[PDB]
Amino acid sequence: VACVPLLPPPEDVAFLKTAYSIYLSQNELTDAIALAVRLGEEDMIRSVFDATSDPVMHKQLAYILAAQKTSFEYEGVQDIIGNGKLSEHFLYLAKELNLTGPKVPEDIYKSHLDNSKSVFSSAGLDSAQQNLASSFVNGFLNLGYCNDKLIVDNDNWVYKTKGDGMTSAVASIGSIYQWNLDGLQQLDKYLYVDEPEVKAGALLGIGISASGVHDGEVEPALLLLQDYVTNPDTKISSAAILGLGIAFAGSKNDEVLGLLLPIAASTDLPIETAAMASLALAHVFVGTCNGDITTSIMDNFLERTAIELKTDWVRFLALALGILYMGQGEQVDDVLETISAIEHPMTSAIEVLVGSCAYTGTGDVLLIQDLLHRLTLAYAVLGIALIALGEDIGKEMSLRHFGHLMHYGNEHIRRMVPLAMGIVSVSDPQMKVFDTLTRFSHDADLEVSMNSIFAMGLCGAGTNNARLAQLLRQLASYYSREQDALFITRLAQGLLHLGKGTMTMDVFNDAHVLNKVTLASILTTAVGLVSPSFMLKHHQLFYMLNAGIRPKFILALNDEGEPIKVNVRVGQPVLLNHGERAELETDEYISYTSHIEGVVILKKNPDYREEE
Amino acid sequence: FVSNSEILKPFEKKQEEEKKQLEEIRGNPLSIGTLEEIIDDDHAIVTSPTMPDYYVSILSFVDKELLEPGCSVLLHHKTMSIVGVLQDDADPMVSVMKMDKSPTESYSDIGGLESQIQEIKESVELPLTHPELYEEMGIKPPKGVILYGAPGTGKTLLAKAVANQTSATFLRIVGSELIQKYLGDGPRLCRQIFKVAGENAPSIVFIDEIDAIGTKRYDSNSGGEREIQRTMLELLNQLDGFDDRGDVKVIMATNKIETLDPALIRPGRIDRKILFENPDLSTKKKILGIHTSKMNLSEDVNLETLVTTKDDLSGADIQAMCTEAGLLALRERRMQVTAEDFKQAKERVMKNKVEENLEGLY
Amino acid sequence: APSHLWDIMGDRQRLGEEHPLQVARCTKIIKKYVINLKQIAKFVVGLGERVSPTDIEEGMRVGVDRSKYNIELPLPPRIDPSVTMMTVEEKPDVTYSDVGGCKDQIEKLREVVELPLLSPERFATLGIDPPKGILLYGPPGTGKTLCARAVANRTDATFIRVIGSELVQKYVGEGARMVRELFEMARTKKACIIFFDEIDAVGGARFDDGAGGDNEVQRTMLELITQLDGFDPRGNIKVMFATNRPNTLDPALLRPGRIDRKVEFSLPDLEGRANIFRIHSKSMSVERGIRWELISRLCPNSTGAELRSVCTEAGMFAIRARRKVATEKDFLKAVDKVISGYKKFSSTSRYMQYN
């Protein structure tokens, strides 16, 4: 554990894959811990449940299993098998289906933030032009805190908005009710009223509130929502793809797969409203194994079936392939056929980085050398960000590489640098990227400036000012201009109040592996966010951040894992309980199997009786 | 195609034309000078090291905000025009002497002070690395800490490990270099140290081994009785003469802070008093295990025996016994150091300088 | 960026020879102008084309041409001062209301300084003379400079910061030049403020015997007194003397003719120390229902530096003692910490007064 991962300046984690041969029929209680984490092969993760006959020890393995996702996510572990089973090597109960994932604890966590509430800027304002401004602010500001004053009493900030503004207005209501037992009944007010514009925001608000729970808590409520994917209505079909696509993350279904193929193939703007449909297959099916999902997109890429015309959507299909081949092994050849078919400026760097999940690692010799030949384009910075995490050699070079690449015609490369750096910006503050944003703030078009304010907010998302004092000077150039400009200037300010001012951006887990579902939201906003750029699609693209936000909680459990208050080392309010708010806290106490930080089950030696 | 021809082509062409216009400005007839004062008429007087007088206008690429008195600007030989602002010519040549970027230190060698280590971390490491702590609660972070205690406790190593976590420049000051006697010159050197820390704002100010002149204790550089007033009060005039909310944090350290001027302490800037003590026997195994990690020990050598023998010793005394015992076996060319070398090292290093009180039992 | 907005004019004010003048100082005026070069060379010239006969004055830098010497443009006098050019600041930090409590120290300074500057016609009715100088010494740690900066904010003019160690230079006799550099800008820039910091390092009477090399310190004040009150009573701006050692100063320095209003800071009482915690209660975190009058009563008479340390240290207990905000229990722990714990040095407490 303390030797294999890092001997040299670089890192090679692939050495644990060869151990599966000699540990095949044996493994060990300790050996199965290292195999289930890190790479986390499907055969390796199921081995720790076979070597351990204790159903109580299988609980702690399930709490980290929900955080790992990847290998075991969709049907066959969760849902059907997760309902219950009687056998030696399975032992999956109903408590592991809920308490482990963000299902039951997120409701208790929601009530804890009620007493921690701070001064809020929430207001209904007057005109629908500025109601969209407060809609984006109230979305991330009240997240985790239930506010019934604005949602119920004053509808001026909701009902007055129409079109795409009405869809984004209800999205703020879903974020306020997010992390609740049932988020569908809270939106029943605007669920069905009169027009499809009012009915559109309901599917987007429920999808945001259902983020983290694919199958529902006590009922398969999200299973019945799969029929709303295909609708002849205009506004509803737009929010059903992106809204439910976030809620359907982690569920592999041929019904959802079959309905999204003709939507992205034809790409009918006034009716089907296909925007994220290309990325909907990437965000829902991430971490799964599908060999036919890349073939269907490949045929639509070259042939351009149905009414597909514009080449911008053609490149969006090739960029949507990036998440599709992750964890697919040798199936990455379907993407290589699309690069040689239609030449795009962003596809020159794709063929180099397809080996990230193909070789089960990155940072190789040929992978780095081929990126220098392509740069001397926009996609080449994805693999570099993964190298900077485990290797400091390419991390220092990434500072000079990311600086010169932020100047390009399209905004694709422009949004990728601050997003990847903004996630690690809390751990390693870097002002070199913020200095380049000066020219990126004012360049030519005001639409670039509109997308610039939202891009700067993603860097310090969850933290108000503090280390952003250097970046705050770039934000001071935008305060107020007109009614429509209020939504432009509040893009960064709305993200500073995320989680009532204090949040942590974590794309990985305590198992020393990154979550592919969280990584899927990174490329989703990079390929997306077309509305602030040219060819405005839908204003709902600003709410995609909730798909990648990981809930912050630590469970305090007894020897049996029951939701009872246990007195142990406190976290980040002063009493640690089930669903209590804490983050970045280690554990020196002994546990059952696969000791991890955060959520853990603690035991006491038979010599004494204690809760520690 | 269309955008690249109207952007990249005129950009590379314009940059080549700007360099051609520099032949009449930055060309071979080029000289330097020292800026004196600036006037609202776009004119200034600059004196070169040859002591001429040049009164001219101001050229492009530079405004008056970057032009400060005492700096070195760029002049011309014929037209004698002021080109632009420049840094110190040849630089002050101060790079790494008392200052560095990220020194290498850990918490293992300073172990045993953990009771007093949490005091300097929360008052220095926490507000600098995590500024949101005092901003969200509105509290004011401590603007300095004072260090007092017996030597050998890792006084310098205490703030050395904190500098690596803050990832900022760590300044130091020698007590004897400010009191140097040329003529006066005591307060003049003090201003140049804090002036550099204001431009880049490292937000870290530390002073190691404050001495000055308590009584004499110098030969070449004395300063007399007037140096005590102009030196010790100059460090006070830095905090008392300027109000800096969140940036400059002044940390003072020496062997004895009691004999210092109570005004030099400057209460209200330093709200934390940290006392130094020798590490106990529980923390000596962490320091001893590091130096003996690469050492070859015999079968009769026990690490718990050397720790028990040590009584009232500093951190440097742990590695001293390993150095003395290592040289005894090195002269005899032995691989594993015998237990006799460890026994002779712990007994000798114990009593060397002062064996007896020389009078009575005390 | 403005590359071409300048060189367009480069064919007139640059190619031609006008500006490259040799800076020099004029000595005697015959109305023939005797001017001494910086190279130590003397000559005589007349007026210029645009030069007025009343512009050239005695003891003023006058730029002359290098080839054929002639007067072209006059230059501001005293180009030698350098360090004093950095003593001018703008927009200070401490405001007028930052001083804890309202006491006699605030009301007496605003009438002798802020009042004649803001309302010059108020004292003109009675035809009196406003005090030129003031006196602020007191014990240290009381925020003496905090009250001095409160006046510079209301004035909104030039503030001259003078350090006591700045008067003593690295050359013998240069200290006399540094004094004239301070009063020369008083005539150039009207209605400004000069402030001395720790004059004890200079101001004082050391008599004669016992040193032999310390006579350079006493020669600075004798020039400072001459530049203040000389044969000609020349003065405009107010003068502020501040130091922490009033007893070691010149016994003549405390006499009238320079300092008129004498205000000595005193230890705040229970009513004075109460407002210190109230002005700090708006900051940090204060629990609702806590009475700061009981906290200030447990604290004995001390300097204001330890008073602000109570509210600062009170926020430090919440991290170690596992507290959300600052409670009353953490306030009592600060009494045993900021006061009882620091009772070993780290304070004056009637230490430095006379000896």
UniProtKB/Swiss-Prot annotation, chain A:
Superkingdom of the source species: Eukaryota
Coiled-coil region list: none
Alphabetical UniProt keywords: Phosphoprotein, Proteasome, Repeat
GO biological process: proteasome-mediated ubiquitin-dependent protein catabolic process; regulation of protein catabolic process; ubiquitin-dependent protein catabolic process
One GO cellular component term: proteasome complex
Ranges: PC repeats: 168-200, 201-238, 239-273, 274-314, 317-349, 419-450, 451-485
One GO MF term attached to the UniProt entry: protein-macromolecule adaptor activity
Similarity annotation: Belongs to the proteasome subunit S2 family.
Remarks, miscellaneous: Present with 306000 molecules/cell in log phase SD medium.
Job of this protein: Acts as a regulatory subunit of the 26S proteasome which is involved in the ATP-dependent degradation of ubiquitinated proteins.
Name of the protein described by the UniProt record: 26S proteasome regulatory subunit RPN1
Originating organism: Saccharomyces cerevisiae (strain ATCC 204508 / S288c) (Baker's yeast)
Gene designation per UniProt: RPN1
Full-length numbering of the shown residues: 250 to 993 of 993
UniProtKB/Swiss-Prot annotation, chain B:
Signal peptide positions on this chain: none
Keyword rRNA-binding in annotation: no
One cellular component term from this protein's GO annotations in UniProt: nucleus
Annotated keywords: ATP-binding, Cytoplasm, Isopeptide bond, Lipoprotein, Myristate, Nucleotide-binding, Nucleus, Proteasome, Ubl conjugation
Subcellular location(s) of the protein: Cytoplasm; Nucleus
An MF annotation (GO) of this entry: ATP binding
Binding residues annotated for ATP, in chain numbering: 149-156
Glycyl lysine isopeptide (Lys-Gly) (interchain with G-Cter in ubiquitin) crosslink residues: 160, 181, 216
Keyword Nucleus: yes
GO aspect biological process, one term: positive regulation of protein catabolic process
Family: Belongs to the AAA ATPase family.
UniProt function note: The 26S proteasome is involved in the ATP-dependent degradation of ubiquitinated proteins. The regulatory (or ATPase) complex confers ATP dependency and substrate specificity to the 26S complex. Has ATPase activity.
Protein name listed in UniProt: 26S proteasome regulatory subunit 4 homolog
Organism: Saccharomyces cerevisiae (strain ATCC 204508 / S288c) (Baker's yeast)
First and last residues shown, out of full length: 75 to 436 of 437
Curated annotation (Swiss-Prot), chain C:
GO biological process: positive regulation of protein catabolic process; positive regulation of RNA polymerase II transcription preinitiation complex assembly; proteasome regulatory particle assembly; proteasome-mediated ubiquitin-dependent protein catabolic process; ubiquitin-dependent protein catabolic process
Binding residues for ATP: 138-145
A GO molecular-function annotation: ATP hydrolysis activity
GO CC, any one term: proteasome regulatory particle, base subcomplex
Function: The 26S proteasome is involved in the ATP-dependent degradation of ubiquitinated proteins. The regulatory (or ATPase) complex confers ATP dependency and substrate specificity to the 26S complex.
Origin superkingdom: Eukaryota
Entry comment on modification after translation: The N-terminus is blocked.
List of residues that carry Phosphoserine: 52, 119
Lineage start: Eukaryota, Fungi, Dikarya, Ascomycota, Saccharomycotina
Predominant place of localization: cytoplasm
Compartments where found: Cytoplasm; Nucleus
Entry keyword set: ATP-binding, Cytoplasm, Nucleotide-binding, Nucleus, Phosphoprotein, Proteasome
Organism: Saccharomyces cerevisiae (strain ATCC 204508 / S288c) (Baker's yeast)
Additional detail: Present with 105 molecules/cell in log phase SD medium.
Family from the record: Belongs to the AAA ATPase family.
Protein name: 26S proteasome regulatory subunit 7 homolog
Subunit structure: Interacts with UBR1 and CIC1.
